[PDB]
Amino acid sequence: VKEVTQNEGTKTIANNLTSTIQVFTDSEYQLPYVLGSAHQGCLPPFPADVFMIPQYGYLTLNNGSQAVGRSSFYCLEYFPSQMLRTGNNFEFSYQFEDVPFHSS
Amino acid sequence: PLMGGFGLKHPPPQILIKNTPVPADPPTTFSQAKLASFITQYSTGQVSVEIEWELQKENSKRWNPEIQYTSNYYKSTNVDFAVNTDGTYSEPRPIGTRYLTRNL
Numbered sequence: 001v002k003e004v005t006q007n008e009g010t011k012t013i014a015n016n017l018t019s020t021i022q023v024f025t026d027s028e029y030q031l032p033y034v035l036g037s038a039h040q041g042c043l044p045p046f047p048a049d050v051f052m053i054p055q056y057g058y059l060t061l062n063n064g065s066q067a068v069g070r071s072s073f074y075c076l077e078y079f080p081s082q083m084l085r086t087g088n089n090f091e092f093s094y095q096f097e098d099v100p101f102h103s104s
Numbered sequence: 105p106l107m108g109g110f111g112l113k114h115p116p117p118q119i120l121i122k123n124t125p126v127p128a129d130p131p132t133t134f135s136q137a138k139l140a141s142f143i144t145q146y147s148t149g150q151v152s153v154e155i156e157w158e159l160q161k162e163n164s165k166r167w168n169p170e171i172q173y174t175s176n177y178y179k180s181t182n183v184d185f186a187v188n189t190d191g192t193y194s195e196p197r198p199i200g201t202r203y204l205t206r207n208l
Binding site for chain 1: 163164165166167168171205207
């Protein structure tokens with residue numbers, strides 16, 4: 001985790017050792033599932049590339065630009081999430097349900 | 105079913121009921137013809153039906169309030185889903201089953 005600060009025109013970057021990040025998986029699928037729309041931001045094909053992580057957003061029922069009564073709002077801080085400092089790591093395992101072979 | 109419902113290959117069996125015919129006095133000389141004269145008759149009774157239903161509970165991380173089915177707050181000449189002055193039970197409106205939301 002790194003803090004960056006501006007002084008006049010110069011930039012400087014320094015480690016912040018005590019800061020955290022928050023990570024959770026939506027195991028229960030309680031969020032709008034935004035994968036599978038073929039959006040950008042996947043891991044690069046070539047392993048030496050460094051990639052930026054895409055911002056999360058979602059769409060809800062609308063009429064014009066306005067929202068209807070069934071429109072839902074989700075606060076992501078309202079799930080349990082693991083908080084990691086620079087020495088922490090995160091892991092989980094997932095098993096695919098039985099699916100027919102893709103026929104190649 | 106297109107009217108809505110649960111399609112069942114073996115639905116609840118249909119129950120058939122009939123008053124056993126009771127003949128009026130036959131003639132004293134034999135006749136082959138079937139007896140066309142009966143005692144006018146009817147039956148009454150009680151019927152109980154008990155269905156156990158399985159529920160799928162709503163588990164949702166939606167922050168803002170759902171739409172619910174609620175009765176009208178304002179005053180009225182008579183209560184909805186209740187008898188009137190003459191004793192006639194009436195149902196004001198059809199009540200659909202979907203007020204909750206899920207993510208598609």
